[PDB]
Amino acid sequence: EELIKENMHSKLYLEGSVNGHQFKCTHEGEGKPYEGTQTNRIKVVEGGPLPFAFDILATMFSKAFIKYPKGLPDYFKQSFPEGFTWERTMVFEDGGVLTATQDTSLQDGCLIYNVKLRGVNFPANGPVMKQTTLGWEPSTETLYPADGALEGRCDMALKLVGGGHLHCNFKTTYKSKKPAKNLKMPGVHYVDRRLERIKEADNETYVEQHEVAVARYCDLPSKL
């Protein structure tokens, strides 16, 4: 954690395909990893403008920026200098599936993100391909220790134009590149998040996102 400063910058490279359309993205981001906040400036550098709602990519663009209270070990910040990876599946209730993998490394004080994603079977008449989405609802991920890794589970929803939601189930595995003997494993815990688009230009080829993420134990009373 000594390497994760109170202010950190990040650079991201992303390659993907959705319904067979190839594209690339970059971001420059900065945030306050112990305050759980960050902002990224995202560019679609190849294959843009995209024929599908940029919203579906918004969670591809940062686990080192979660505010962890003292007494809840921070798996992500503990992983440095080696860093960590994640492998995610996103299943939309109208048929679209996205799988993605991500490498997070630290070079010269800068966080480097490498993402690869593949999305298929998004319906031609659905809100993703028609671009009638309006951002994600805030969410809670549960994180479960599993053999040195964390498993995350999260139900998320995209707001739609005209009202209602398109539901999406997220399953993620987070893996430290550090040896397990050097990590204190957290228990089961929860990460509350709010992802907001703060600005866009040029048919979503330029996007500014803000995220706040705060980790906690379950604070409800316990009889046992």
Residues 6+ apart with CB under 8 A from 37: 31, 65, 210, 211, 212
Token pair 């040896």 is found at 179
- Separation in Å, CA 160 to CA 10, 20, 194, 197: 30, 24, 17, 15
Q: What is the resolution of this structure in A?
A: 2.0
Domain count, the chain: 1
Residues 6+ apart with CB under 8 A from 15: 22, 23, 24, 115, 116, 117
Q: Quote the CA–CA distance of 120 and 100 in Å, as a whole number.
A: 12
Q: What is the span of the domain harbouring residue 169?
A: 1-224
Token pair 């309006």 is found at 134
- Cis amide bond preceding 81, omega within 30: yes
Q: Quote the CA–CA distance of 13 and 23 in Å, as a whole number.
A: 11
Q: Quote the CA–CA distance of 100 and 86 in Å, as a whole number.
A: 8
Residues in the chain: 224
CA–CA–CA angle 137, 140, 145 (5° rounding): 150
